[PDB]
Amino acid sequence: SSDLEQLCSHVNEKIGNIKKTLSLRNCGQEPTLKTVLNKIGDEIIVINELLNKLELEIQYQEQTNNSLKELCESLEEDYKDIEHLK
Amino acid sequence: YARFKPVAVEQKESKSRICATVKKTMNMIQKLQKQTDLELSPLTKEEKTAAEQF
Amino acid sequence: PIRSFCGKLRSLASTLDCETARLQRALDGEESDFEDYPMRILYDLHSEV
Amino acid sequence: PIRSFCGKLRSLASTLDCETARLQRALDGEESDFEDYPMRILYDLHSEV
Amino acid sequence: DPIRSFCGKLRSLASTLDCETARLQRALDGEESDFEDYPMRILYDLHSEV
Amino acid sequence: HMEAEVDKLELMFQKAESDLDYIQYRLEYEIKTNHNPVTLLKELSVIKSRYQTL
Amino acid sequence: HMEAEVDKLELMFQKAESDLDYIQYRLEYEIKTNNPVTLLKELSVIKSRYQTL
Amino acid sequence: GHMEAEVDKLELMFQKAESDLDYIQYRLEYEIKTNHPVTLLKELSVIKSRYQTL
Amino acid sequence: QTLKDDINILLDKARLENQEGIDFIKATKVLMEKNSMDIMKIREYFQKYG
């Protein structure tokens, strides 16, 4: 790495570091960004509750497919019973 | 969604399997009603539910 | 470690942005830097001679 | 001289694409490669032992 | 570490060889969808520019 | 513009990383929750040696 | 699909290049419808002779 | 050899992967050869300039 | 947004499959009672005939 190149990288780092601290100021001050940022942040809270609901609905869905299997089982016993006999 | 996708098809099994056992258990009874006499009707709640199995 | 790449990439972009803009203007006769500075160094060169 | 860069960049993408996909699946119990192959080498290892 | 550190690099070249040979076949065959779907989306952006 | 494009690419990479980071975080959570090929290799060395010296 | 994203980036660069390429092409066309170089060499011959004299 | 043998396999696989890729390519080339965006980019530059000059 | 759509959309298909399930078992358990009489009615018959 040359003395020239090393300078450039010093520059880009100062430049880049500003641009980041810039967007940090913009997004935390300017209103139009600040809403769309809260709109996302709010819509995260809901899409989080939508998960908990999907969680219970899964551990419910399973527990019926469990019963809806355990029924189907007993129901091929009482048929193979009536299939053998009559 | 991947805790879901199987439970979703292992229902169709248990469904489309029960729906096969009862259709068979039903035709013995419509063979054995024919062969000798008697009667009945499914009466609403029963035929309602038959829509589900068809 | 990520941005470190992009930072370099970015600069090549910023450069591409900035210089394509001005070079068009220069081609068109705007931007002023291109008829203003060569003057100033030509006038220095004159002053030398 | 353009693509030569991007080609490298691209491969890092393709990789990022492909592996993020499968690793999720693997985490979830799909994708099959991850319970299938360690079996096959564990069974070889057994056959050695 | 210096063991896997090698293989890790080797491995990635494999995973790449795996993944891309697969899809490129599909793409050749008309499946995989990424190859007729994305060029669309960037061609449609390019159109929108024009 | 291209700078803007790049800003996106960087943004994507950052996501990919926290994506990977999560997957890992979870695997680690799984492992620490319930309850060893490593030592098994050494032992398979211990025997292959212990044996063929004998 | 970052590969897709990259496909775009590469597309952009290729544009930027043919953009630059045009600008150049025009400038070259401009000069053809019509220099400080030799002026530097001449300005050395004088500075030399005065200092020799 | 032993691991040497394993490596012999790996090399063999790679060589396959290559001729695999090589075929896919060969076919694509065949498909295109049967009937005979690049220039479109160059054209899209000349106008985006002329707008700016005028 | 599209993510909160899908994550919602899915939840719906599961709310259903727990339902389309939770009344099948009952919709089936009524044909059970019907076929249960219909045998007991056939059985009571064939023992006597009259």
Swiss-Prot record, chain A:
Subcellular location: Cytoplasm, Cytoskeleton, Spindle; Chromosome, Centromere, Kinetochore; Cytoplasm, Cytoskeleton, Microtubule organizing center, Centrosome
Top-level taxon of the source organism: Eukaryota
Coiled coil: 47-86
Described purpose of this protein according to its UniProt entry: Component of the SKA complex, a microtubule plus end-binding complex of the outer kinetochore that stabilizes spindle microtubule-kinetochore attachments, promotes alignment of chromosomes at the mitotic spindle equator (chromosome congression) and assists suppression of the spindle assembly checkpoint. Kinetochores, consisting of a centromere-associated inner segment and a microtubule-contacting outer segment, play a crucial role in chromosome segregation by mediating the physical connection between centromeric DNA and spindle microtubules.
The family this protein is said to belong to: Belongs to the SKA1 family.
Protein's recorded name: SKA complex subunit 1
Species of provenance: Homo sapiens (Human)
Full-protein positions shown: 3 to 88 of 255
UniProtKB/Swiss-Prot annotation, chains C, D:
Residues bearing PTM Phosphoserine: 32
Compartments, record wording: Cytoplasm, Cytoskeleton, Spindle; Chromosome, Centromere, Kinetochore
Function comment: Component of the SKA1 complex, a microtubule-binding subcomplex of the outer kinetochore that is essential for proper chromosome segregation. The SKA1 complex is a direct component of the kinetochore-microtubule interface and directly associates with microtubules as oligomeric assemblies. The complex facilitates the processive movement of microspheres along a microtubule in a depolymerization-coupled manner. In the complex, it mediates the microtubule-stimulated oligomerization.
Protein family per UniProt: Belongs to the SKA3 family.
Subunit structure, as described in the record: Component of the SKA1 complex, composed of SKA1, SKA2 and SKA3. The core SKA1 complex is composed of 2 SKA1-SKA2 heterodimers, each heterodimer interacting with a molecule of the SKA3 homodimer. The core SKA1 complex associates with microtubules and forms oligomeric assemblies. Interacts with SKA1; the interaction is direct.
Protein name: Spindle and kinetochore-associated protein 3
Curated annotation (Swiss-Prot), chain E:
Function text: Component of the SKA1 complex, a microtubule-binding subcomplex of the outer kinetochore that is essential for proper chromosome segregation. The SKA1 complex is a direct component of the kinetochore-microtubule interface and directly associates with microtubules as oligomeric assemblies. The complex facilitates the processive movement of microspheres along a microtubule in a depolymerization-coupled manner. In the complex, it mediates the microtubule-stimulated oligomerization.
Compartment list: Cytoplasm, Cytoskeleton, Spindle; Chromosome, Centromere, Kinetochore
Protein known as: Spindle and kinetochore-associated protein 3
Residue numbers carrying Phosphoserine: 33
Superkingdom of the organism of origin: Eukaryota
UniProt similarity note: Belongs to the SKA3 family.
Subunit structure: Component of the SKA1 complex, composed of SKA1, SKA2 and SKA3. The core SKA1 complex is composed of 2 SKA1-SKA2 heterodimers, each heterodimer interacting with a molecule of the SKA3 homodimer. The core SKA1 complex associates with microtubules and forms oligomeric assemblies. Interacts with SKA1; the interaction is direct.
UniProtKB/Swiss-Prot annotation, chain H:
Coiled-coil zones: none
GO molecular function: microtubule binding
The keyword Cell cycle is assigned to this record: yes
Entry's localization field: Cytoplasm, Cytoskeleton, Spindle; Chromosome, Centromere, Kinetochore
GO CC annotations on file: cytosol; kinetochore; meiotic spindle; outer kinetochore; SKA complex; spindle microtubule
One BP term from GO: mitotic sister chromatid segregation
Keyword flag Cytoplasm: yes
UniProtKB keywords: Cell cycle, Cell division, Centromere, Chromosome, Cytoplasm, Cytoskeleton, Kinetochore, Microtubule, Mitosis, Phosphoprotein
Domain of life: Eukaryota
Chief place of localization: cytoplasm
Protein family per UniProt: Belongs to the SKA2 family.
Role: Component of the SKA1 complex, a microtubule-binding subcomplex of the outer kinetochore that is essential for proper chromosome segregation. Required for timely anaphase onset during mitosis, when chromosomes undergo bipolar attachment on spindle microtubules leading to silencing of the spindle checkpoint. The SKA1 complex is a direct component of the kinetochore-microtubule interface and directly associates with microtubules as oligomeric assemblies. The complex facilitates the processive movement of microspheres along a microtubule in a depolymerization-coupled manner.
Protein's name in the database: Spindle and kinetochore-associated protein 2
Source organism of this protein record: Homo sapiens (Human)
Lineage: Eukaryota, Metazoa, Chordata, Craniata, Vertebrata
Gene: SKA2
